[PDB]
Design a protein that fits this description.
This protein is about 25% helix and about 35% strand. Helix 5 packs across helix 6. The chain binds guanosine-5'-diphosphate (GDP) and magnesium ion. This is Elongation factor G.
Length: about 650
Amino acid sequence: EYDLKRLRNIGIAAHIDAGKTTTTERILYYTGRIAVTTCFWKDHRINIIDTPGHVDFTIEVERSMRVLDGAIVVFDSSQGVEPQSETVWRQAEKYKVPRIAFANKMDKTGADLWLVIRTMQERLGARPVVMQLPIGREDTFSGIIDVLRMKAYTYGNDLGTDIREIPIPEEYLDQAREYHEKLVEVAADFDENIMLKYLEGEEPTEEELVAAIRKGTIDLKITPVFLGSALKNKGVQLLLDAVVDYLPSPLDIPPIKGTTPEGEVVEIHPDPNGPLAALAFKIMADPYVGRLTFIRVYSGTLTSGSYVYNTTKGRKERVARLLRMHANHREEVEELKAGDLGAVVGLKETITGDTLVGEDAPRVILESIEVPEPVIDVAIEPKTKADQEKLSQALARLAEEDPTFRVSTHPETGQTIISGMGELHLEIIVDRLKREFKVDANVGKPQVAYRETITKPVDVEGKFIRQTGGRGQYGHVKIKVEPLPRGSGFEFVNAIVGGVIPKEYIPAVQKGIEEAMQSGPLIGFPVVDIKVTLYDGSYAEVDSSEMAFKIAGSMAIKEAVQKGDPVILEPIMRVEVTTPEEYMGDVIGDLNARRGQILGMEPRGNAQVIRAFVPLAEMFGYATDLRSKTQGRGSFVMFFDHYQEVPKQVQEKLI
Ligand SMILES: Nc1nc2c(ncn2[C@@H]2O[C@H](COP(=O)(O)OP(=O)(O)O)[C@@H](O)[C@H]2O)c(=O)[nH]1
Ligand SMILES: [Mg+2]
């Protein structure tokens, strides 16, 4: 019942509103008549990996490219290859995943198969190949002509319940032959047996044509193009056939690659009997059974009721039950092998992105272990305590499913501060909270998580001598604070020596420092990358207390940071801007205006991918300015790289 050769992990992707959901639903319908939904067609298992809701979900998208094997790009046949279409395309190119295209909405007014073919050629340099011609134009669209097999199909209704293989109507008869000749030509580019025949004017075997087009599609050399109307149930069954005919099995594509703890890259091969290696890519919380953590098995076998090792951490996780999600029901399975996908129940310490392995297998990691330094802060204020109550709750819960964000209570304001990887991250989170959790609050505008730090050693003291509330308080500390190498964080060294400061308070003076670091002097942002050494001070036999030293520590640090030629530190993003050749130095000047630094340009497909360093504070509304200069065709990804000292000029302003 299992056989790689007949597995087919795909993922539908299209410009928003083009027809991804409908196309997927119609697939499940047709295959159904007998995060990752499975189904069968012509003796083949199709695992429809669920691609991110929108291309902007960059991280999610790249991960889904690695989790799927083949793709079906859906275009609105009346719009052609739109901006996002281009975006997903670049993505598909980046992960070299074979693909086929589907011209959807052929039934709609303005729908044109040639607009999709031409724009695919033009914008994407896709080298499409006409796999079929339509019958009827708009509301009169009624049939599809397979031009590889020279046969037509007409549809009795808009319900996908009356399909009839009629011969090609004389009226498109010539066009079919024209494209069939053209289709044979393309196939000859991948098979000499066919090239010979083509030249001979001979007719190659369907099995021959189908295999060469497949070879080509999987070699990233061509893109079969099919058409239809998802909503009007036309062409979907023909699309299901294309999937099996031309889309790759876990054996047709190069193996996924992973890194061992030794930093050594490795090719993980799709060997069911080899050591297990799987990726968890979507942690969902199903109503009955709790959290389903979806995984892609790359090699080896995942067994039900067993132990897998989480290399992205270091503990044995327990896979309770394994299920395959079908269109209208769940199915418990005894195991999932190489090239397959499913949802494992259990696994409480495993989060999306982690790697699970054989427990007696190499400890490879399919993804980086690094963590997204929170670079965007957004304040939230529940509106009624009742909303406040279910807010921090929704957070605790949502915090486990995704730990790439941190929450804090702003020092002075006392406000709740959610921090993420970028405006978008925070956007989906915030949204998720008002919807899934129906928590309504006032959400502040996103800002960059600046940090503060000194740039020269200082030796200061903190005294807190006061008759506070009747009794006297006395705290005296003398610390030496010096700058730590960027990224070292915090270090407290207690060099105290003669009971000079009663041990009873050492931790208390640290508590004071930790708190006065929650707000630098320049802009009241966190102080980081500093070494603090308490070496002297004094106490009052009766007047001292944990509080006096606590405050004494707070004072000492405010003093130390204000005196050490403090400097503001801003996040520096690593930006990859994929753009059409034409708008080249055009986009390069903008990034330089954003105080950027280009690191080079290495082409992708028929487009140019520019790599650069740009300060996050300069990326606000970049998505817009970009499309403003790449005439809507450009796009880009962005990641945190390092923290940097803001320029002399920049500083004087932020202050
Ligand atoms: N006329 C027509 N409408 C379609 C077709 N496919 C999808 N739609 C409609 O277009 C809208 C967006 O489609 P949907 O699949 O949700 O787009 P998605 O954002 O790509 O998932 C919905 O109103 C669909 O019913 C099609 O072939 N023809
Ligand atoms: Mg949708």
